[PDB]
Amino acid sequence: YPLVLKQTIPNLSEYTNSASGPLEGVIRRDSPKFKDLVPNYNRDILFRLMSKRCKEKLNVLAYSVMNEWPGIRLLVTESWDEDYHHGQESLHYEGRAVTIATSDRDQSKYGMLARLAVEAGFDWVSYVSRRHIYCSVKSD
Amino acid sequence: SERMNWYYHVLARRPYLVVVSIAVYCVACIIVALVLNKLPDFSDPTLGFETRGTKIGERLTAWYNLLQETDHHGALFSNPSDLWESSPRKEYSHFVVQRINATDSLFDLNGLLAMCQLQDQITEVPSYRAFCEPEMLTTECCRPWSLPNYAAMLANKSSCFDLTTEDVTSLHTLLLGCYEKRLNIVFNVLNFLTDFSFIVYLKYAMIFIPVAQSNRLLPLFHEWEDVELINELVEVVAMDLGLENELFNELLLTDVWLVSLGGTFVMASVWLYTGSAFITLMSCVAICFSLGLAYFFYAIVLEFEFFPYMNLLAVVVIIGIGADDVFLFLKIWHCVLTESLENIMALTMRHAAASMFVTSLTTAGAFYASYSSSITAIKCFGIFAGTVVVTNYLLMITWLPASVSIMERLFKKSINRFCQMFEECITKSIMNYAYLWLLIFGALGASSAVIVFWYPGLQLPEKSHFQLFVSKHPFEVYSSLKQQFWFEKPYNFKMHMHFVWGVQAVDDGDYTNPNSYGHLHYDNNFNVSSRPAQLWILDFCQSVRQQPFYKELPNCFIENLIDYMKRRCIPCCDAQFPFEPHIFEYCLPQSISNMYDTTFFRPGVAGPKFAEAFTPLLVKALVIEFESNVAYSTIYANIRQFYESVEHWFQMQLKTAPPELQGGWFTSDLKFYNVQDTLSHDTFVAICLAMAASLAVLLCFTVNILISIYAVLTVSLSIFNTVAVLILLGWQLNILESIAVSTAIGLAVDFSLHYGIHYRMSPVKERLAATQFVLSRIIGPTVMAATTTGLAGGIMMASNILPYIQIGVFLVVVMIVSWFYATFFLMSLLRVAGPQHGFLEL
């Protein structure tokens, strides 16, 4: 019920066409794809730029979290990347991936957080570290 | 045939034009579907295993997709206000173990320090350190909550020092004294560990590891594939790990290379059949080219995407067919030589036409008509095939006579001795012994008849798991072990049926890829308010309370409603059941968000589903729960009758409702059952398809009828016995085998047909005489063709897979045995009973 470190949901390649899929290119301020990116001014969350599907899943997750945690809230540790920190490939480069943690930053918590992630309707998850979890979404 | 004669002549004339131009067309379409289309890959096989287009397809589809349509988006939403404004578990990998000398309860010490060894052998791996996850922030490899660890742990020693001699004893004492002191849980933990098989004489041991369960440990899968870990007393007997569909791919990758092998086998056989290994090159590359060609037909032309690997088998299928016209042809060549070039070619070709044409035609006819199935990979398979077949057909027809001409324009003894002797001794073994083989065969024929049909029917599987490998595999060792244990159970999840109204029910998914389902509609003869309909609601709810399979809080929502209603004021207060529609849906969602935010908060499904049409509300549609007197099983007829009578009464009430309310339907997990019915139905269907097909052809050519009769019977009993052969090795039913069956027809037919033809074609009208002609002039190439087929089949066998080795079986049996069948049985039949002197011709 609470996720576990290194778990991958589904137990596949995250790019499996139905889990998250393969990347479709980086987004930079010049690329017209940035025309469609959205920042999350959702003040129940802590930062913002990400995808409309990432938006969907983020906001359906946000308050199920608070139902999971009073006093602790949706903290976005890493939403969108343009300064080349997520390797030669990342959905952070197109505002779809999210490295994620609670507003309280407590390790053994995330296992259950990731759980409600899927319970919100996310497409791919992993307790990919104690420092953070990873979540991702299909091509819109 | 005039222009046809000119055409034969052009073949006589100007080869390299076509040679090169067709090479061109090939590489063209080849690289087109190569590059434009991507290389389809298989994360897993469990694909297209639905049956869309079924009534149940409508049902499951609207159901699933509506459900993925519920509340995560859309105005469809749960609460009408939500509109408005370190102990282990299966999730860690694990091993199944045992002791294999004295065969005793593992409760003893000998096996304990045997373990100590095995453990220090186990976690000793550095690649393990890779995924070790040394927890505690200590770089300390998080400890195994294991048995000698348990022991030295409630000891104050280090594991393996546990000093069983009395430790073991007092413990077992705790265990019987155990049943639900309570030191932390170790009791109940190691309850999870093993099975009911101790109250003694636990058969197995079992490992957990504080480690991840994924596809990520492949390297370590290998690295323990290297090491047995079974030193003296033991066996790591069933290792349960999620790395399956990966090995799947890799081993297909192994076996294709292994397959080019039997390819080269048949290549050599042919070359030596002529000592011209120029033509062997011609043939093999024609093969691979027709392959790529039909590919481009597949991915690029009708532009298809989903390439179920099972279609791979066409390869080890086609390999047996492409080699027959070969020896069919060479023989005519050598003979007519024994009796300019253009006309000689034209004749021998007038003489091969029927053979090659008809053969390929029946085969690809079966494969094609595979398409009438209710299934995905099936149509994939049949379509792919039919193309590949028809390719090789034209390939030889045209590519090849050039092979001949040019091999010429260029321009041991033991073996002719041998083949001479062969035909001779055979001819005699015939001419001398008349009904021996006949009666023997008829006996065994009706034998396999009773074999298959009466007593040992082809009973189906109910444990599905759709096993993959050798039924002996550690992964498959674990296939049986589960429910013996604790952490295994759904007490059983009783059949929880559900019913719906307010949506339509179809699936406009693209019937080919398993990722196309469409968009769900809405059934709107369905007034969510009208009293007469309301009152049928409530008599309906009444009606199930009366059933035994009625098996017994949002259920029958109306109750919480009228509670909130009759619940007096301080609009929605102190009210009865039949009443307004607008005031109704006006007070309802309030009572509903009420029951929601209450501590009831039943995580549930049956009931309403909302929309903003306060802002205006409504329900789009809504549903009802019920439990069953029955729970989970993979058996057939129990669930069958269950659904049957259930739905029956469903109607019995439905029609009673105001047609306002007959917009609904009924759910369960029959899909399994959906298969276990529709599979056989559609199978038999297609069987009869290809049957009637080959029937039409036989009546087309060998016009006299006795001929096709006797052939039909030969090959039907071949069918019977090959099937009951599968029986002698004792299969459960799956699609694969329905498929190979279907093909059997266009497979076996050709032998019998060549025979009946040559004889109908002979200039003689007597049993023995025309018979002997056809002998001399038909015999061998048949044998060579079935021979290549057996080569390919039988060589898939000492391999890893159900599919491939299964298939080699299918091949070898069917081909060889249908051969013997029409190769002596019918031989006798018309040894004595041929139509002579214009007898029974059309």
Ligand SMILES: *[C@@H]1O[C@H](CO)[C@@H](O[C@@H]2O[C@H](CO)[C@@H](O)[C@H](O)[C@H]2NC(C)=O)[C@H](O)[C@H]1NC(C)=O
């Ligand atoms: C079902 O039928 C009823 C009546 O035929 C519909 O409702 C009435 O119409 C509106 C509804 O908001 C209101 O004026 C009253 O509640 C009813 N009319 C009166 C009292 O004159 C109702 O909307 C229909 N529901 C659906 C889903 O079609």
Ligand SMILES: *[C@@H]1O[C@H](CO)[C@@H](O)[C@H](O)[C@H]1NC(C)=O
């Ligand atoms: C350590 O030894 C004491 C004394 O026998 C025992 O009570 C205790 O259970 C041992 N350790 C553990 C972890 O149980």
